[PDB]
Design a binder for this molecule. Sequence first.
Ligand code: NAG
Ligand code: NAG
Ligand code: NAG
Ligand code: NAG
Ligand code: NAG
Ligand code: NAG
Ligand code: NAG
Ligand code: NAG
Ligand code: NAG
Ligand code: MG
Ligand code: MG
Ligand code: MG
Ligand code: NA
Lengths: 322, 322, 322
Amino acid sequence: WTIGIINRVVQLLIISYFVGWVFLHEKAYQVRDTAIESSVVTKVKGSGLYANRVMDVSDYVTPPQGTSVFVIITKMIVTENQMQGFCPESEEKYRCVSDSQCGPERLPGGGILTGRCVNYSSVLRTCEIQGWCPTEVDTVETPIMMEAENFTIFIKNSIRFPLFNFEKGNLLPNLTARDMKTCRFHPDKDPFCPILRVGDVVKFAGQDFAKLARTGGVLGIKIGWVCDLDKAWDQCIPKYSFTRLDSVSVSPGYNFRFAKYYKMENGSEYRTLLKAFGIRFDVLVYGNAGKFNIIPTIISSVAAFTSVGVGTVLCDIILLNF
Amino acid sequence: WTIGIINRVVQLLIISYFVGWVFLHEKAYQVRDTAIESSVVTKVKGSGLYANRVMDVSDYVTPPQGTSVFVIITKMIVTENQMQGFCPESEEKYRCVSDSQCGPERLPGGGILTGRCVNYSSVLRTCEIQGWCPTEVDTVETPIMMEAENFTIFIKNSIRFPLFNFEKGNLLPNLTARDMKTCRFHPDKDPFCPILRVGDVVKFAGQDFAKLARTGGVLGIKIGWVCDLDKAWDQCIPKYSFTRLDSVSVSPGYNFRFAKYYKMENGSEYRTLLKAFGIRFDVLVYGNAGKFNIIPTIISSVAAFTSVGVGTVLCDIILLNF
Amino acid sequence: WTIGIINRVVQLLIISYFVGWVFLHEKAYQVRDTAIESSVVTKVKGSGLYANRVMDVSDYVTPPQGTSVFVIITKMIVTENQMQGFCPESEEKYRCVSDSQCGPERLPGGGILTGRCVNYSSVLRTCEIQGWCPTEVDTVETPIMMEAENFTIFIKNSIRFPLFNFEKGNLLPNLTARDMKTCRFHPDKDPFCPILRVGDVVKFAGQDFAKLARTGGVLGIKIGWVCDLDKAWDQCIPKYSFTRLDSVSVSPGYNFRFAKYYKMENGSEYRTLLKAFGIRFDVLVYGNAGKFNIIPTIISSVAAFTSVGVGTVLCDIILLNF
Ligand SMILES: *[C@@H]1O[C@H](CO)[C@@H](O)[C@H](O)[C@H]1NC(C)=O
Ligand SMILES: *[C@@H]1O[C@H](CO)[C@@H](O)[C@H](O)[C@H]1NC(C)=O
Ligand SMILES: *[C@@H]1O[C@H](CO)[C@@H](O)[C@H](O)[C@H]1NC(C)=O
Ligand SMILES: *[C@@H]1O[C@H](CO)[C@@H](O)[C@H](O)[C@H]1NC(C)=O
Ligand SMILES: *[C@@H]1O[C@H](CO)[C@@H](O)[C@H](O)[C@H]1NC(C)=O
Ligand SMILES: *[C@@H]1O[C@H](CO)[C@@H](O)[C@H](O)[C@H]1NC(C)=O
Ligand SMILES: *[C@@H]1O[C@H](CO)[C@@H](O)[C@H](O)[C@H]1NC(C)=O
Ligand SMILES: *[C@@H]1O[C@H](CO)[C@@H](O)[C@H](O)[C@H]1NC(C)=O
Ligand SMILES: *[C@@H]1O[C@H](CO)[C@@H](O)[C@H](O)[C@H]1NC(C)=O
Ligand SMILES: [Mg+2]
Ligand SMILES: [Mg+2]
Ligand SMILES: [Mg+2]
Ligand code: NA
């Protein structure tokens, strides 16, 4: 009967259309390179005021080379003119009543205890320690550099998909609305401008610059390179997203210690101990490209052929039985 | 004959069970994301004694920011109060008999030779050089900071599988036996505590802290995120492993040079040249996730269907022929 | 007819040979690990002359630890003995006629303006600023360190394919023609020597050391680990390639700022501000391994079986119809 082939032809049309659209949607004919090879060069610009001092890129940016991870110092605690010696620790956790509880068994991971119980102040009595004296007092409150909100981060990113040897950069003057020197990234108005405003990055991550600068934190500038290398070079485009990575028992924030080492004319050594709170920026470059390939196209082909060949039988059984 | 379908039914049961278990074991129905996107923040804690000096995190940890690669300095060689000028190199390799063998053709990659053969000491005669004087003597023996064995490394790791947009952290208070502030990673007792004892890490890597601290080395704290995103969020868990990466013509160990730059009141410049031996720690975050997908499930389906369809024919040929 | 099976047998021979060679060429029977896990330790060696000063590894290499990204400083601009205060900016862009155009609304991202229009020189009048004085003059011309062309970069690379747990290093004494201590990488004569001549790396990247050292730049030492883990351990070999990553509205080159901080005996602080131009080196380790696997071999098998089964029908239709 001719209707039998009109029923079968309809079966193949519909079923083959479902399978076809499904496989075509997932790019099942494409080999994928998900091992992007990226280089990141960052440049921070701005100047701020902290106490009655002016901080420039050489003062608050660390490291200086413009790597993918850098830190903008927003608040800091200074302990000036430290020198090796003995002194009573100012941390209450080191409180003692006699030299019998200042032995090596107490606070094993802490500082070096001399074994004497000494009077830090009239209200506290702590174990004496050998090290940089006086000791740090990290419980005071200090200001934060507010101008850091207006600083700019310029990200030059040069990536390459090695499976296809397709390398490209994120400096695209044609895609930017304004000049590169004066543009400013906006997710909607200028989403390809490589210049980001620090405060902007803090907002895109859903963070308050006040609390963040106060406690420090870790933000991620995410560069995504999802690309169809079957299309034009013009179509492989970077997409920027933003997130706070420290998020959140453990106290939030981000700080690290470093000293400025000075020596006296008579030769003795003394340092300035600095506890730095700031916003660390991690440039995270993800990317995956898809290029047409014979092997995945054949495997997907056989898959759709056989799958349709079974679906038509099952649909005949469902129809005829009814 | 009915037995013919009892033989065929048994064929399909057994063969289909083999194929089924095989494909089900390898998660052939899952798409895999092997491009984890990780952020690492490290914090070292401890104090040590070197010579008659006390080293704190600002003295022996480099860099300070808490990156994925950092160095704990265990032994160092100091050459104090260097100043630009001319002096005889102390390296024997520069030995000379006359100014005729101190020309630019000799040791091209080394220091800057003035062209004079001078007497470093009464027992050695070396080419004179222009640079920081006096020169370094890196053949002496110096102590090592033993307290570094008791230092602690705290690793906060925040990763994300982008193909699925599944981001998670390694601070899991529910999985840890003790409090986060006081716990300590143990592969068996507390395998999710992010706090590692330096000496412990040295042991897990099969290394002697004495020799390692003496010669320096490169260890890797490996964080693995193998995850089945079909299961609960609770099931995606990090697993820590440890290894020595420098391992091993070339002399083992790890050291690097840096100077502390001082200036005189009259304005002349002089530095302290430091050769640092320590244990570099590389946080290596691997991970791959698997999520059920329609395309791989269909491809695997067709594969098992056809493969069974052929296996039953071959098994009929093997049975009937016998 | 017997010829019918001689036509079919020829069909299967030829078609099955095409399909077979195609699938065998692309390693369709292999699972692939494209998430290499690499560790990079770099060591720079050399000494140069800048002005009448000698620069050693502690002077021009930054950072010092030997990471995968480091900078060899070739030219620099010094601004000595800066001190916090007020002074007229030397940048023409800050030119003013009266204190009415030195308000906060002007150059928002720049330095801190006091609000006064002052005379930097007799030929220029600029806004006064608070910060490190005097200000930097980055428009002068300075020399470049030419000896940096003869410096050597030693790259120790230790990688691991985790899906197969196959870890290996790039120090291969058997593969090198010369001793490791004295060899020197040559793409043809010694392509496995880990010691690279800086000038050589500049040439392999198609760059002129004069212009590059003058303006600075970003080069990539690419280490590729394409491996067939079905073959011998001896066959997994690294291949080195080279490229300039900054390439290229924006001014080319690479520079960054850092200061040397000194303090006076009376306690006042003053720094030496340094603008550094050099060649940043990014070690980029790519790699992907392929190991025989049952699942991909079965999927590829079914694919070739069905594809041939259809190709023979189509070829019968093409032949018989003719
Ligand atoms: C580590 O600390 C313990 C105290 O908890 C102490 O007994 C031990 O001697 C320390 N180890 C070293 C190497 O100092
Ligand atoms: C950039 O713009 C010019 C217009 O003058 C155009 O010819 C060129 O193709 C553009 N490049 C890309 C990558 O679109
Ligand atoms: C160096 O001088 C300072 C004060 O000028 C003094 O505190 C210190 O003890 C001196 N160093 C030595 C080793 O005497
Ligand atoms: C590099 O060293 C060789 C000696 O091996 C020397 O002849 C040459 O001039 C050096 N190159 C530069 C740029 O100084
Ligand atoms: C953590 O512990 C609480 C117990 O109060 C539990 O309700 C919560 O689900 C746990 N979180 C995870 C991720 O297991
Ligand atoms: C600075 O003084 C030191 C000794 O105080 C001396 O060695 C040096 O030559 C002086 N510098 C100059 C340029 O005279
Ligand atoms: C940022 O700059 C603008 C001028 O463009 C200024 O009005 C604003 O106050 C600045 N923001 C901060 C936090 O100083
Ligand atoms: C290195 O060389 C020795 C020759 O003495 C050889 O036995 C060994 O197998 C070689 N190693 C590799 C990895 O080829
Ligand atoms: C410290 O001395 C220098 C000159 O020796 C002077 O310029 C500066 O004003 C002094 N500092 C203070 C706070 O007086
Ligand atoms: Mg404290
Ligand atoms: Mg030496
Ligand atoms: Mg300027
Ligand atoms: Na298939």
